Amino acid sequence: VNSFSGYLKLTDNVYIKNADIVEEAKKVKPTVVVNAANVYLKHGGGVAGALNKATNNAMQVESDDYIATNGPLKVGGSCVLSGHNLAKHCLHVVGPNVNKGEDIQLLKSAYENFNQHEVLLAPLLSAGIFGADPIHSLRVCVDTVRTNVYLAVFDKNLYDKLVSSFL
Numbered sequence: 001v002n003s004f005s006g007y008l009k010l011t012d013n014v015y016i017k018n019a020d021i022v023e024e025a026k027k028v029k030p031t032v033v034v035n036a037a038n039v040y041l042k043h044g045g046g047v048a049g050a051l052n053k054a055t056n057n058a059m060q061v062e063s064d065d066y067i068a069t070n071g072p073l074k075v076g077g078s079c080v081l082s083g084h085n086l087a088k089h090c091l092h093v094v095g096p097n098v099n100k101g102e103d104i105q106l107l108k109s110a111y112e113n114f115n116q117h118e119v120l121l122a123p124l125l126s127a128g129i130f131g132a133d134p135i136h137s138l139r140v141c142v143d144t145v146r147t148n149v150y151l152a153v154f155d156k157n158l159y160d161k162l163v164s165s166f167l
């Protein structure tokens with residue numbers, strides 16, 4: 001038993017809710033919140049900009065130190081950093097950005113990072129400003145992640161569509 005409320009169960013291990021991930025994180029305080037990161041951990045907009053704003057820019061300060069030490073992430077890769085006031089940990093995961101021409105096949109690799117964590121609160125990778133089809137992203141999620149994932153979908157209209165079209 002865990003503290004997530006109001007989710008619709010899609011599969012054995014995947015759940016979905018129309019929610020603002022920042023507010024969900026603020027209430028649940030999950031062990032892991034997933035950020036929709038880029039390779040530079042520049043949290044300017046989308047999910048990342050919202051999460052970072054909610055940390056009063058502490059996420060960005062920590063991220064800049066990480067990059068200065070380690071260099072950029074790989075597309076499809078991840079790193080674990082602090083969750084600040086939102087979660088114990090933040091798993092920064094880089095899905096491909098279609099608006100940058102990156103290979104959508106890397107979306108499966110991106111979701112594989114979730115399997116290193118028993119339970120996660122997450123957005124749909126490569127959705128939103130990353131330019132992928134959120135329905136495809138949901139399919140890859142369901143077919144790749146084996147751990148327990150609670151997906152927060154900000155847009156109510158999108159949410160209805162994802163549910164109604166789910167196979």
Ligand SMILES: CC[C@H](CNC(=O)CCC1CCCCC1)Nc1ncnc2[nH]ncc12
Nearest residue numbers: 021036046047123124127128152153154155
């Ligand atoms: C990481 C990508 C996801 C995609 N899913 C969305 O719902 C985005 C809203 C529209 C989706 C349909 C039209 C474009 C925007 N983006 C977020 N997912 C959860 N929470 C969030 N907060 N801010 C962004 C965001």
